[PDB]
Amino acid sequence: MTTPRRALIVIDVQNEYVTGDLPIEYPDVQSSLANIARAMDAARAAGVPVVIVQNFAPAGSPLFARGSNGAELHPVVSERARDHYVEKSLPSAFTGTDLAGWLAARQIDTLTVTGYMTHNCDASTINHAVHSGLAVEFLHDATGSVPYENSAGFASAEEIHRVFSVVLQSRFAAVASTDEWIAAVQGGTPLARGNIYASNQKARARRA
Amino acid sequence: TTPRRALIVIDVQNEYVTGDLPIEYPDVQSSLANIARAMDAARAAGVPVVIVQNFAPAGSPLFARGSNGAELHPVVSERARDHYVEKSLPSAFTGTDLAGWLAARQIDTLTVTGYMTHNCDASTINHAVHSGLAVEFLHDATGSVPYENSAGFASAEEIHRVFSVVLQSRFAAVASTDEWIAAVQGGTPLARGNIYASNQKARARRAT
Ligand SMILES: [Cl-]
């Protein structure tokens, strides 16, 4: 087997999600911030390129407003080194940006996703990556969601994050812990991916 | 102003009904019936109808080329259509002419029906939004299956609800088939939610 050639992308780790008005609720945000930092430190030690993504909305916007505290990168990011930076104003870190080219220029075959939110920025970015031919990894303990209620119904942060983690594992990404990822980097091994048939069979077999 | 819609009917194949990937929520007869209604309402209004069929290789457990499971369900195979694409990844854009065909017909709004909510439908919607299309998702003309894998468990109800709520928060106007039919007959758009509102309504359940 070929050794995975990973890039770690740290998506929208900004104060809005922590001290601001879109507070991450599951996993616990302090626990995911700590794992983001471990993943970044491990990546730097192992020579895995680290890409920071920052999301902006216009000045005066209620969230992620240019010039506001909430739009600034959290100290976990800002006090660390990085190898690349991408600003975005859409969920996906690829659309219209230099990300795909930058990755390709570094022979990246595997994009390891951390940051926020699981169901929006992270999932959009992963969807683009998968359909471009990249393998994707998702660190379930270095990511997270918020609860939502709207005309379509209610879903908690735990339900959103779990659903997305399980769906990702079924088809789109290797879902793993930060500890698991760090070890796989050390060993030069891929992380395990699930599949739709196994995933649905297991749930059905249990219901039986 | 009046949307220029196309209705896309994704992967309404026997695998999901009589085969080995049975849709569990919403009830599959109820969503098949609504897909039928939506197609007929589109037809009557001159809204174009696009059919998508997903194939895996001959001999695969699901969607195998040559198998009954891979065939379109008669609800859809016996009806009129304006366009057809076959695909082999979740998004109906990747490796198909879909974006080109929609562009040639000056489509600005894509209405999504068919299966699965969290896989083919979500991936198609995420591509469409990022290409600049407006998207609608008919929550009673779509559906999910349960999954269990190394990332955890989630039921079909949880998966469909979580994706319906997340889509309403940012990616699509989520509506019932009746609401869509009324919007087509009236030449009006459907309502979209937003992330900040969705999160604020959920946070109010704490009742501090
Ligand atoms: Cl698995």
Chain A residues inside the 8 Å CB shell of B196: 21-22, 62-63
CA A175 to the chain's CA centroid = 10
What does R_g of chain B's alpha carbons equal in angstroms?
17
End-to-end CA distance of chain A: 38
Chain B: residue whose CA lies nearest to A94 = B130
| Beta carbons of A154 and B145 less than 8 Å apart | no
The pairing of beta strand B134-143 with beta strand B147-149: unpaired
| Beta carbons of A155 and B169 less than 8 Å apart | no
The angle that helices B28-45 and B177-186 make with each other, rounded to 10 degrees, is 10
How many other β-carbons are positioned within 10 Å of the β-carbon of residue B188? 12
Query: B206 C-alpha vs ligand 1 centroid, how far in Å?
Result: 35
Assigned CATH for B1-208: 3.40.50.850
Which value, to the nearest 10 degrees, does the dihedral of the CA atoms of residues B197, B199, B200, B204 take? 140
Phi-psi map region of B117: left, alpha, beta (phi>0 left; psi -120 to 50 alpha): alpha
Tokens at residue B188, please? 């009006």
The three-class DSSP label of residue B1 is coil
Beta bridge partners of B113: B9
Under 8 Å CB-to-CB from A156, ≥6 apart: which residues? A25, A26, A147, B202
Distance CA A77, CA B157 (A): 37
Under 8 Å CB-to-CB from B111, ≥6 apart: which residues? B5, B6, B7, B8, B38, B42, B47, B135, B136, B137, B138, B180
Name the experimental technique.
X-ray
**DSSP category for residue A115:** E
- Write B100-103 long-range contacts (CB < 8 A, 24+): B101/B50, B102/B6, B102/B50, B102/B133
A122 contacts A113 by C-beta, under 8 angstroms: yes
Chain A residues inside the 8 Å CB shell of B91: 127, 131
The pairing of beta strand A148-150 with beta strand A153-155: antiparallel
Residue of A150, A161, A201, A204 to mutate for B, most B C-beta atoms under 10 A: A150
Assigned CATH for A2-208: 3.40.50.850
Domain locations along chain B: 1-208
| Beta carbons of B130 and A140 less than 8 Å apart | no
Closest residue to A159, CB basis, from B94, B162, B196: B162
DSSP string of A120-175, one letter each residue: IIIHHHHHHHHHTT-EEEEEEEEEEB--EEETTEEE-HHHHHHHHHHHIIIII-EE
Distance CA A93, CA A87 (A): 8
Q: Report the run of H or E that residue A179 belongs to, with start and end.
A: helix A178-187
Q: Measure A80 CA to nearest chain B CA, in Å.
A: 29
The angle that helices A29-46 and A178-187 make with each other, rounded to 10 degrees, is 10
Bond before B57 cis per omega within 30 degrees: no
Query: A182 C-alpha vs ligand 1 centroid, how far in Å?
Result: 19
Provide the chain B residues 62-91 that lie in CB contact (below 8 A) with chain A.
62, 89-91
Using the CB atoms, write b or e for B71-110: b if 16+ within 10 Å: bbbebbeebebbbebebebbbbbbebebbebbeeeebebb
Closest residue to B199, CB basis, from A22, A172, A196: A22
Q: Which of A146, A155, A86 is nearest to A116 (CA)?
A: A146
Provide the chain B residues 28-67 that lie in CB contact (below 8 A) with chain A.
61-62
* C-alpha dist (Å) from residue A195 to A166, A200, B63: 10, 9, 14
Give burial (CB, 10 Å; 0-12/13-18/19+) of B186.
exposed
What does R_g of chain A's alpha carbons equal in angstroms?
17
CA A63 to the chain's CA centroid = 19
How many other β-carbons are positioned within 10 Å of the β-carbon of residue A106? 13
Beta bridge partners of A73: A14
Q: Measure B206 CA to nearest chain A CA, in Å.
A: 11
Alpha-helical runs (H) found in chain B: 28-45, 74-77, 98-104, 122-131, 156-166, 177-186, 195-203
Under 8 Å CB-to-CB from A178, ≥6 apart: which residues? A35, A38, A39, A139, A141, A142
**Number of alpha carbons in the 13 Å side-chain half-sphere of residue B119:** 29
Q: Measure B80 CA to nearest chain A CA, in Å.
A: 30
Tokens at residue B180, please? 């869509």
| Beta carbons of B119 and A171 less than 8 Å apart | yes
The sheet carrying A110-116 orders its strands as: A84-88, A50-55, A6-11, A110-116, A135-144, A174-176
Query: ∠A160-A166-A170 over CA atoms, to 5°?
Result: 140
Distance CA B5, CA A32 (A): 41
Give burial (CB, 10 Å; 0-12/13-18/19+) of A201.
middle
Residue of A25, A138, A163 to mutate for B, most B C-beta atoms under 10 A: A163
The pairing of beta strand B134-143 with beta strand B173-175: parallel
Q: Which of A12, A16, A23 is nearest to A87 (CA)?
A: A12
